[PDB]
Design a protein around this ligand. Structure first.
Ligand SMILES: Nc1ncnc2c1ncn2[C@@H]1O[C@H](COP(=O)(O)O)[C@@H](O)[C@H]1O
Length: 399
């Protein structure tokens, strides 16, 4: 049996996952769970001007990990920290000072197996393949023909990933390009994954793309009457509803423009912004949609918000938007407390139309196509986090 410890140092906070794999690479319970997990805030990126404190911040998590894993396993336990690409946007050599600060700490403070490559910037493409491993691991799909694996889409704050397995033909014919479109992984059985990560098309990031389309004027993607400013990655965007409030049809046309559906496509078929769509096919008919594809439905009463996933169809998002887009900020706040908690009430109509467009016009999903959206996925009686962590533990372990 191996344990594995994967830190996820994203933009808002740092999380640790710990799994215990049995001899046949199935998960063993750790206490009552199949996954151990704690988070802290803020994220590494808050310590740009104090990188030492970024490493020191992780101390507790490391210590939960050190404790959660019996001492007897430590020397042989892989500890990996994957930080989000957000870090590269820090001025100067901060990015690397922070990693280095993490490296030092783990070497000084960890009793785990800390290899020289434990601490890296992960990036969207790898977030995508790993997530695909997380989900097909859990579902019992590894070792199946690619045609019976489950596609994954992940909507994070800044970028959205699509990853799904393709045919030998498709892989050998994939265009050339800057992240490669194909990621060859063996799991045993060799898989060719289409992988693409779209920067600027994450949940938070999308709004900036969408808001830019109307520039300093009112956006019919903003609910009546919010009159304000949306800040993303330092940049400010006026978010004022028109006189008559949000409007589904006008917003959709803005979202479509913002997606660059008409960007010219040098390949067989594109999604948007010139990106090869990967050819589609059977590796893509079943989909698991993570993170914000779940959080939005959870937040607008599309599923019991105690639950952690739901089967839905894109059209359900459209129909919700049709409703939400006629409401004012007061109604929305009242109806959808979760949207108040995250500060996104004025974005309600936009986020729904956005997820509909991304999925249907963007990715070419049939709007009557049921998909699973979830932040966790069921493994036996328990839940695992629908995140890249398990997939990266799984690949670290197969080594
Ligand atoms: N209901 C929600 N609405 C919006 N964001 C959420 C919700 N639940 C969790 N999140 C965010 O998911 C993010 C993960 O992104 P990262 O920090 O890059 O790993 C966290 O920053 C959370 O704030």
């Amino acid at each position: 049996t191996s344990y594995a410890v994967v830190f996820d140092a994203g933009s808002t906070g740092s999380r640790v996952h710990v799994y215990h794999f049995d001899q046949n690479l199935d998960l063993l319970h750790i206490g009552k769970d199949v996954e151990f997990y704690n988070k802290i805030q803020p994220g590494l990126s808050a310590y740009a001007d104090n990188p030492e404190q970024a490493a020191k911040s992780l101390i507790p998590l490391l210590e939960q990990a050190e404790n959660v894993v019996p001492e007897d396993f430590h020397s042989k336990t892989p500890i990996r920290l994957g930080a989000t690409a957000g870090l590269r946007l820090l001025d100067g050599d901060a990015s690397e000072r922070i990693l280095q600060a993490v490296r030092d700490m783990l070497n000084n403070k960890s009793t785990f197996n800390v290899q020289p490559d434990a601490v890296s910037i992960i990036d969207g493409t790898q977030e995508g393949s790993y997530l695909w491993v997380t989900i097909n691991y859990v579902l019992g799909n590894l070792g199946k023909r690619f045609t019976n694996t489950v596609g994954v889409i992940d909507l994070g704050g800044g970028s959205v990933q699509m990853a799904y397995a393709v045919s030998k033909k498709t892989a050998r014919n994939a265009p050339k390009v800057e992240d490669p479109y194909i990621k060859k992984i063996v799991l045993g059985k060799p898989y060719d994954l289409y992988v693409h990560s779209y920067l600027h098309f994450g949940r938070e990031a999308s709004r900036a793309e969408i808001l830019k389309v109307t520039h300093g004027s009112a956006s019919p993607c903003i609910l009546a009457g919010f009159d304000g400013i949306y800040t993303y990655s330092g940049e400010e965007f006026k978010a004022s509803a028109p006189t008559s409030g949000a409007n589904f049809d006008k917003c959709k046309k803005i979202i479509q423009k913002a997606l660059k559906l008409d960007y010219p496509c040098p390949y067989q078929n594109c999604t948007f912004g010139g990106i090869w769509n990967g050819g589609g096919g059977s590796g893509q008919k079943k989909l698991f949609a993570a993170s914000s594809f779940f959080y939005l439905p959870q937040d607008v009463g599309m599923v019991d918000p105690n639950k952690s996933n739901l089967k839905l169809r894109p059209v359900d998002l459209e129909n919700k938007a049709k409703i939400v887009c006629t409401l004012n900020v007061e109604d929305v706040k009242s109806a959808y407390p979760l949207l108040e908690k995250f500060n996104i009430v004025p974005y309600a109509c936009m986020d729904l139309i956005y997820q509909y467009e991304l999925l249907v016009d963007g990715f070419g999903l049939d709007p009557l196509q049921e998909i699973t959206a979830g932040e966790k996925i069921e493994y036996q009686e328990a839940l695992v986090d629908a995140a890249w962590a398990l997939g990266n533990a799984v690949e670290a372990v197969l080594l």
